[PDB]
Design a protein around this ligand. Structure first.
Ligand SMILES: [Mg+2]
Ligand SMILES: [Mg+2]
Ligand SMILES: [Mg+2]
Ligand SMILES: [Mg+2]
Ligand SMILES: [Mg+2]
Ligand SMILES: [Mg+2]
Ligand SMILES: [Mg+2]
Ligand SMILES: [Mg+2]
Ligand SMILES: [Mg+2]
Ligand SMILES: [Mg+2]
Ligand SMILES: [Mg+2]
Ligand SMILES: [Mg+2]
Ligand SMILES: [Mg+2]
Ligand SMILES: [Mg+2]
Ligand SMILES: [Mg+2]
Ligand SMILES: [Mg+2]
Ligand SMILES: [Mg+2]
Ligand SMILES: [Mg+2]
Lengths: 61, 154, 78, 50, 117
RNA sequence: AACGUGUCGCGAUGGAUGACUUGGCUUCCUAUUCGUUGAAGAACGCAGUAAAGUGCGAUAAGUGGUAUCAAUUGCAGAA
RNA sequence: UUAAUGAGAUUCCCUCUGUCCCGAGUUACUAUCUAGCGAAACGACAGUCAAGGGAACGGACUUGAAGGGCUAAGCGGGGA
RNA sequence: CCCAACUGCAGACCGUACUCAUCACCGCAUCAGGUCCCCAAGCAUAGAAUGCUCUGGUACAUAGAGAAAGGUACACUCAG
RNA sequence: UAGAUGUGGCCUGGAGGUUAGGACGAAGCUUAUGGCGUGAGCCUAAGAUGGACCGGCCUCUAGUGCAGAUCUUGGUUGGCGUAGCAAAGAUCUAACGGAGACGUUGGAUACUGGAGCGGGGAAGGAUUUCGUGCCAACGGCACUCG
RNA sequence: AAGUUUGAAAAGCACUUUGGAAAGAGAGUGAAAUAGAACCUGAAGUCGUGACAAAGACAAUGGAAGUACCUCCAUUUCAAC
């Protein structure tokens, strides 16, 4: 039910860091069934765990 | 050994306890004595309104510089509080003694809270830390709560 | 100052483990055990602490060969 | 942190094993006097320094 | 002394704890062999002479020889969950009625009997 | 009234006391005094299940010899 | 005796101001009330006054005068 | 004779997790203290100043309801 | 008062004697249990106490009587649910989990601001790592978390 | 520091059900659970609730002397001195 593990290592698979991995909230039993960084790499390939775009720090000013 | 007072009729009575009730003896004291002649339904009705903070627990004997409030005039006082942890901890000890009234065959809508009794337990210890390196105690002071019930024949 | 602040400057080690005494009194810089004088052949032993002599006498440990040889010499052999 | 002699390593390993509870087949023994381990170290409370 | 006897008793090795656990032979098994009492052996039929289970005959199931008791096969006791357990009667409260043979028991039994005869 | 008293009964905490005492202490006595053939000490180990301790040392909770008889025992296992 | 230097000591002047005349308003954070948590220093007993006497500036004695009880926030007079 | 280049086999010991601090170390403690080194973005700007941001990290340091007095501030103004 | 002395005088532990109790309830312990001694104290009763030792008397013996030593040790208590938990980052929400302020995920607003609540090491610590549980007491609030 | 010295025996509370589980109430064991493992006895201190004189605070305590009412405490009379 807690997605700390699946979120810790998906940030270590996407190689981005937290507040960049988007764990899909509409399904957790999908994510919770991962419990491994290969079962998470499969999840990343699917919809469930995208990495959200980083940010837009403007520079046109 | 059990139970300071016997209900003077054992089948027309329920009984319930806690032993390490995990919160303050002093908050649990008046939380308990406030319902000590009330019907069981008028006692839960009290506690369930102490939690909504529409009636208070009149602190007697352990009031000692608690604030004044309007909700304590019915109790004939000026002081009183709304101890959440000690009230939710006797919502449970009462609904236990309900389950002891059904178990014997007694309408709980006839149960009167005869003889609540709160006292002090073994007073757990966890030091705290003063200025100048003085290691002072920080006692927890748990409590035992007893109460039995009875019926009132029509 | 000279209290909780100076306690922060506690980085080094004066003493490490004594290979002979098995306790933590082997002064590093000048390499000698502060409790058994290792590498001195004789262990340090001072009558002004008989209580510490008693913590360090025979029988306070395993006493392997003696619990055996004291049995052989008390049974007419050696 | 990363440098410990092997001998100093052999002595903390002998302490990581001594820090296990009394197994619950000991307290049903006939006449033991053991209920707790009463030599359990906690790494924060007390330090070994060896 | 008081202090050294209650220590040589409770601190007695296992082979000592078996002659300190001897039980008297029955009224008609002593003069059968002309001795006074024997150490209780596993599978030696007996009869309790004292206690809540007195006058209850049974076959010694074991000699639980550190509790200082022997276990009789018909002397059982019930736990709370139905499972039946075995109470331990101190051998001196028992009276042997049967023996178990051995070329080391009907040899020492007449070592004790050669004292009489 | 409530609180505060106060006496009584019953409880709680507390762990005194008594009873017990495989410990201490003291006194006396009968014999023989470790190690380079590696001691004392400490270190790490070893149990089917063992953290400490006791015992032991990779023959490890003991192997051998004799001498004793049927247990060990928390419960496995095992002539 | 001295230029420079000075968290050195000192005096004046200028500026500047709530330092003040003379204070006032606002703000967090607290105090206050609550839920949870929870100490301690200290503790003979205590604990209204005036006057008297007294180890000579009394909480208890003497003689008067007040004092129903229990209370929350303060304060700092006393409890040598 | 001697060496290289080409092959062939082998390359042993110990360390290696984690930490390095407003929770891991010292301070009696998950203590506003102390504690060495490396890596070091954008803009304003003389700029490792200070202000704010991207990366990374973090919003379990008790929380709530309010206008007392009094208090504390990396908080203010205040006529003459 | 200091002091001295006496007591067929009081009491505790133990010894030598004697007399004697005790599972039909000993020591102990409780007291609106009386009585009786001027008193120290003793004896009784009654315990919805206790469970196995022990009283009287004559001698002996001593680690023999406690309110007070900033006594010692243990325990409790008042103050007291009081001071406080006020330096350092403001959590807000959904739906989800859960036995339930808690956690997780999403979104939101932030804070650290590259001399950092960053990533790596030494010194030091040595399992604190990790996962899965767990939630008794420890994390000065709480916790489903640590 | 620390005798877990429960009991003779772990016979160490099966099981029912209230609780999310603890714990509770029941049962049940045993001579005692009012011996439930933080367990022989269980004191003082302090606390709790029940009762009361239900008294009555205007420091507590105490002294003497009464009285009120209440006390399975003693004694005596209970056709009599
Ligand atoms: Mg050196
Ligand atoms: Mg040398
Ligand atoms: Mg020497
Ligand atoms: Mg004692
Ligand atoms: Mg010699
Ligand atoms: Mg060797
Ligand atoms: Mg060992
Ligand atoms: Mg004092
Ligand atoms: Mg007032
Ligand atoms: Mg006041
Ligand atoms: Mg710090
Ligand atoms: Mg230290
Ligand atoms: Mg960011
Ligand atoms: Mg002005
Ligand atoms: Mg003595
Ligand atoms: Mg003395
Ligand atoms: Mg005393
Ligand atoms: Mg005193």
């Amino acid at each position: 039910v807690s997605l700390k593990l699946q979120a810790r290592l998906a940030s270590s698979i996407l190689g981005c860091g937290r507040a960049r991995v988007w764990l899909d909230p509409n399904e957790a039993v999908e994510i919770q069934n991962a419990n491994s960084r290969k079962s998470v790499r499969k999840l990343i390939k699917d919809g469930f765990i995208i990495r959200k775009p980083v940010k837009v720090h403007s520079r046109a000013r | 050994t059990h139970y300071s007072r016997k209900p003077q009729v054992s089948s027309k009575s329920a009984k319930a306890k806690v032993s390490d009730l995990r919160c303050h003896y002093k908050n649990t004291f008046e939380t308990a004595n406030v319902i000590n002649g009330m019907p069981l339904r008028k006692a839960q009705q009290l506690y369930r309104q102490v939690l909504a903070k529409t009636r208070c627990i009149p602190f007697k004997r352990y009031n000692g510089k608690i604030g004044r409030t309007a909700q304590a005039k019915e109790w004939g006082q000026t002081k009183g509080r709304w101890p959440r942890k000690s009230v939710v901890a006797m919502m449970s000890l009462l609904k236990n003694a309900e389950a002891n009234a059904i178990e014997k065959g007694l309408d709980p809508n006839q149960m009167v809270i005869k003889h609540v009794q709160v006292d002090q337990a073994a007073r757990m210890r966890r030091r705290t830390y003063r200025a100048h390196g003085r290691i002072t105690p920080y006692m927890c002071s748990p409590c035992h709560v007893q109460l039995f019930m009875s019926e009132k024949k029509e | 100052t000279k209290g909780t602040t100076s306690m922060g400057q506690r980085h080094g080690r004066t003493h490490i483990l004594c290979r002979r005494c098995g306790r933590n009194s082997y002064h590093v810089q000048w390499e000698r055990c502060a409790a058994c004088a290792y590498p001195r052949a004789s262990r340090r032993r001072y009558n002004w602490s008989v209580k510490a002599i008693k913590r360090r006498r025979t029988g306070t440990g395993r006493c392997r060969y003696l619990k055996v040889v004291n049995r052989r010499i008390a049974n007419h052999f050696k | 942190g990363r440098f410990k002699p092997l001998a100093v390593k052999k002595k903390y390993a002998k302490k990581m094993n001594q820090n296990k509870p009394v197994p619950y087949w000991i307290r049903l023994r006939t006449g033991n006097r053991i209920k707790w381990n009463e030599k359990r170290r906690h790494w924060r409370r007390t330090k070994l320094n060896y | 002394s008081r202090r050294k006897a209650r220590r040589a008793h409770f601190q007695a090795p296992s082979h000592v704890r078996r002659v300190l656990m001897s039980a008297p032979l029955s009224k008609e098994l002593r003069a059968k062999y002309n001795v006074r009492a024997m150490p209780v052996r596993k599978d030696d039929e007996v009869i309790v002479k004292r206690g809540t289970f007195k006058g209850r005959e049974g076959k010694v199931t074991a000699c639980y020889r550190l509790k200082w008791v022997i276990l009789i096969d018909k002397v059982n006791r019930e736990k709370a969950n139905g499972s039946t357990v075995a109470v331990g009667i101190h051998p001196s409260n028992v009276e042997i009625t049967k023996l178990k043979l051995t070329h080391h028991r009907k040899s020492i039994l007449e070592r004790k009997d050669r004292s009489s005869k």
